[PDB]
């Protein structure tokens, strides 16, 4: 099921992590590698990335 | 090392796709997933994306 929760969360994490503007290059690459290594962790990885993005907003 | 040529090349091409302002979200998602699955397609996908972006410019 290409549209089940697992797969939608994986695709969405790739797409949304690619968008997050306040990740640096190394951090972004680490998230992508983590997604590839364990797609079951996609929603958790996205949540982690979004928090980090907000922590690293210009101030 | 996760901060490598593979993740960098994906990140650079993917960011070029998603920063094209006139694409819709489904087009950008589909291009990004194709890139994820087949890096050999990067130049092809970037060129298709740019052609669609120009065609969908505001009127």
Residue numbers in the entry:
A (entry chain A), B (entry chain B): 0 to 58
Publication excerpt:
We adopted the Z domain of staphylococcal protein A and its affibody binder dimer complex as a model system. We next generated libraries at the interface of a weakly associating dimer (Z+ ZSPA-1) with micromolar affinity to determine if we could affinity-mature the interface by coevolution. To clarify these inter-residue co-variations discovered from the sequence data, we determined crystal structures of 10 coevolved pairs that spanned a range of cross-reactivities and orthogonalities (5 from LL1 and 5 from LL2). From the structures, we could verify clear compensatory changes between the residues showing the most significant covariations (13A-9B / 17A-31B) in both LL1 and LL2 library mutants.
The first library, LL1, was designed to use minimal codon sets encoding both polar and hydrophobic amino acids (F, L, I, K, H, N, Q, and Y) for five positions on the Z domain and hydrophobic amino acids (F, L, I, V, and M) for four positions on the affibody ZSPA-1. The ability to rearrange at these positions allows decoupling of mutations despite close proximity. These results indicate that the protein interfaces of both specific and cross-reactive complexes were completely remodeled in different ways to improve affinities up to three logs (KD of LL1.c2 = 1.86 nM, original = 2.92μM) and bias specificities (KD of Z-ALL1.c4 (FILFK) with Z-BLL1.c4 (FIVM) = 2.53 nM, and with ZSPA-1 (LVIF) = 21.9μM).
